[PDB]
Amino acid sequence: IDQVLAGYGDNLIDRKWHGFRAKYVVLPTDIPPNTYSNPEEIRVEGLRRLIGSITRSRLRTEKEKKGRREEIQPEVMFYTGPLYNFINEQQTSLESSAINPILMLSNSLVIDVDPAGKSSKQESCTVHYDRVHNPDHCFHIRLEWLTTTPKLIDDLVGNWSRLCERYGLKMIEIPWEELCTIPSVNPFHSFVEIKLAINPWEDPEFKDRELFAKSKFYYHVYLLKASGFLLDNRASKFLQNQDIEFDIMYSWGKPQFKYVQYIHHTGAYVAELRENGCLFLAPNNIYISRVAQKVILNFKSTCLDYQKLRSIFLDAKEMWIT
Amino acid sequence: AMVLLMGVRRCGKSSICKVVFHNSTLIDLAVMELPGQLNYFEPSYDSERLFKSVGALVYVIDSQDEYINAITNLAMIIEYAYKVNPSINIEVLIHKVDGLSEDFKVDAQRDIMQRTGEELLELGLDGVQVSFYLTSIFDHSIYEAFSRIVQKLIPELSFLENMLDNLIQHSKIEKAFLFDVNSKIYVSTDSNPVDIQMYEVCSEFIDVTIDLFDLYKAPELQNVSQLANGVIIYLRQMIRGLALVAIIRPNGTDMESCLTVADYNIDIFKKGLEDIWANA
Numbered sequence: 292i293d294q295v296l297a298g299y300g301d302n303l304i305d306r307k308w309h310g311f312r313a314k315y316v317v318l319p320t321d322i323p324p325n326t327y328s329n330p331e332e333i334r335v336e337g338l339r340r341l342i343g344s345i346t347r348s349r350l351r352t353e354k355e356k357k358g359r360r361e362e363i364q365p366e367v368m369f370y371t372g373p374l375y376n377f378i379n380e381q382q383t384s385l386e387s388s389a390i391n392p393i394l395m396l397s398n399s400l401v402i403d404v405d406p407a408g409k410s411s412k413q414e415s416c417t418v419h420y421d422r423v424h425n426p427d428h429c430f431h432i433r434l435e436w437l438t439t440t441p442k443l444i445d446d447l448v449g450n451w452s453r454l455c456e457r458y459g460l461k462m463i464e465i466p467w468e469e470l471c472t473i474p475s476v477n478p479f480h481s482f483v484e485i486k487l488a489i490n491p492w493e494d495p496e497f498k499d500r501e502l503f504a505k506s507k508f509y510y511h512v513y514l515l516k517a518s519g520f521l522l523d524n525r526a527s528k529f530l531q532n533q534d535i536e537f538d539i540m541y542s543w544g545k546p547q548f549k550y551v552q553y554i555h556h557t558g559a560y561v562a563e564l565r566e567n568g569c570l571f572l573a574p575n576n577i578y579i580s581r582v583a584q585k586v587i588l589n590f591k592s593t594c595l596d597y598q599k600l601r602s603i604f605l606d607a608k609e610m611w612i613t
Numbered sequence: 614a615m616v617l618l619m620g621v622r623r624c625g626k627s628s629i630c631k632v633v634f635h636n637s638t639l640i641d642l643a644v645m646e647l648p649g650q651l652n653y654f655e656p657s658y659d660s661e662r663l664f665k666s667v668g669a670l671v672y673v674i675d676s677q678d679e680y681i682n683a684i685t686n687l688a689m690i691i692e693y694a695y696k697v698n699p700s701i702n703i704e705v706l707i708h709k710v711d712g713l714s715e716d717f718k719v720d721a722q723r724d725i726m727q728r729t730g731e732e733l734l735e736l737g738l739d740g741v742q743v744s745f746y747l748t749s750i751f752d753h754s755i756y757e758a759f760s761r762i763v764q765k766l767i768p769e770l771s772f773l774e775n776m777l778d779n780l781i782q783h784s785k786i787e788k789a790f791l792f793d794v795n796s797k798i799y800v801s802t803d804s805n806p807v808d809i810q811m812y813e814v815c816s817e818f819i820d821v822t823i824d825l826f827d828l829y830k831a832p833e834l835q836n837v838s839q840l841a842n843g844v845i846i847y848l849r850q851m852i853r854g855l856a857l858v859a860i861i862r863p864n865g866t867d868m869e870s871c872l873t874v875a876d877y878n879i880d881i882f883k884k885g886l887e888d889i890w891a892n893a
């Protein structure tokens with residue numbers, strides 16, 4: 292702790308202890324009135340402005356502080372469908388500025404959280420922002436700090452949220468650890484496991500070997516989509532079915548996620564889909580405390596009522612047929 | 614110095630105008646209301662002469678309703694207001710804050726200030742300073758906000774401050790206000806802080822004086838009101854609509870001698886005020 296606090300953090304050894312961490316999730320929710328300056332390309336500009344503000348908030352030495360054009364922001368790249376489809380699509384023999392044997396999905400830099408000299412110390416967090424983004428996949432912004440004041444980072448997050456809300460989107464925060472581990476950390480936390488009423492792998496009304504060869508969890512993903520959820524784990528191995536050019540590693544560490552995670556577009560509840568078709572369901576306490584209980588109960592009712600789940604699965608089968 | 618009142622519908626501009634100005638440079642002129650709804654602004658629709666004729670622009674934000682779009686429209690207004698004339702003082706009033714706590718009021722003012730600053734940073738405007746005031750009709754806050762707005766448009770402020778400071782230093786005055794006959798908007802004072810209680814006392818003294826004069830008419834306003842502890846409240850009408858109200862403490866002296874020296878000193882001050890064209 293003293294070694295990394297003295298500036299000797301370049302030891303490049305996976306330490307068993309972690310600093311203070313906070314993960315922030317950008318969710319496309321709603322366009323504000325006016326601000327015309329299409330509801331599908333203005334969010335691209337919003338992410339561009341967020342990345343530009345983050346890279347513009349870079350911590351710089353006094354020699355570069357006294358001096359006076361900075362480099363352009365790194366490009367965020369867009370695609371549709373699973374991430375592994377884009378990774379496989381990268382085989383084309385053209386260009387070199389396209390996701391470029393471990394693949395770093397994010398990049399890290401040190402920021403200057405207190406610019407006005409409010410604090411007598413020096414304030415410096417670490418940010419990580421992804422190099423990929425989809426309208427159907429949530430965006431990850433992370434914040435790692437060890438000794439910073441937990442109020443200047445709060446108004447920095449508020450500034451980022453306001454800069455988002457001028458455009459569309461809605462910045463939200465979720466726990467860094469997996470949803471399945473909250474009972475093993477916070478026993479008072481609300482956490483319910485959902486065994487859905489109709490099992491699509493054995494129901495006579497809903498069964499096809501070709502469909503499960505294409506998409507095994509097609510009905511569950513469509514249920515989560517119709518209930519208003521966004522995929523959190525964009526780099527998981529439970530939805531896509533393709534190969535890879537060795538493992539993918541984030542800029543902060545290896546993704547140790549047991550199951551795929553899903554985030555409600557409101558930002559209030561977190562869902563998690565298991566291997567055996569069971570669903571996890573729990574609210575986001577940080578958003579509730581920073582800023583509403585009938586929606587999660589309604590989602591539990593739709594996952595437990597036979598008729599409504601049957602209607603959603605019938606809609607899924609009708610869309611699959613046509 | 615014609616001030617322009619701008620805001621969304623049902624924010625309280627007409628009620629503010631009625632309460633203040635119904636109960637040139639310095640007198641309470643007929644101000645201009647302007648209902649600004651959300652829309653796309655037409656580029657230079659002969660509004661340059663209008664905004665060039667405005668001494669200071671005043672914006673009204675309703676704290677009860679959502680105000681992010683109001684701040685966005687305000688930023689759009691400032692975007693051409695500062696471009697047309699770079700000498701316009703811009704004022705923003707946070708109206709309808711009577712039913713809010715002090716902490717909530719301060720947090721709301723800080724949030725509005727941060728949002729306006731960030732939006733002006735996005736639009737690229739620099740060198741512009743916008744003042745913010747927490748105003749409400751039911752109390753003294755709107756009067757003080759309009760007092761600051763009017764004081765920002767009188768170039769002879771420091772000389773009046775020096776004159777009132779000398780008058781108070783040589784007459785044993787506790788606090789002297791240079792009011793105006795209508796709207797109770799005090800124009801100048803001393804370096805002493807403007808006490809809210811004393812300001813309300815002087816304003817109700819103005820109201821009592823004007824009402825009692827209006828009760829007996831059809832046959833230069835002067836009024837001396839002495840309390841039980843010897844503290845007197847003096848009134849003397851200045852040039853045009855200006856009126857001087859002072860609270861003079863006796864400090865264990867003769868009442869009539871204090872009245873005589875205060876009358877002579879205030880007459881000298883009025884003779885000095887005759888030379889400067891601060892009236893109207």
Ligand SMILES: Nc1nc2c(ncn2[C@@H]2O[C@H](COP(=O)(O)OP(=O)(O)O)[C@@H](O)[C@H]2O)c(=O)[nH]1
Binds near residue numbers: 625628629711
């Ligand atoms: N409580 C309170 N209400 C106010 C205040 N100012 C205005 N209002 C309300 O605003 C309404 C009148 O708005 P109005 O002046 O006609 O809006 P405008 O025509 O767009 O300027 C009244 O019903 C008042 O209740 C205030 O300072 N306090």
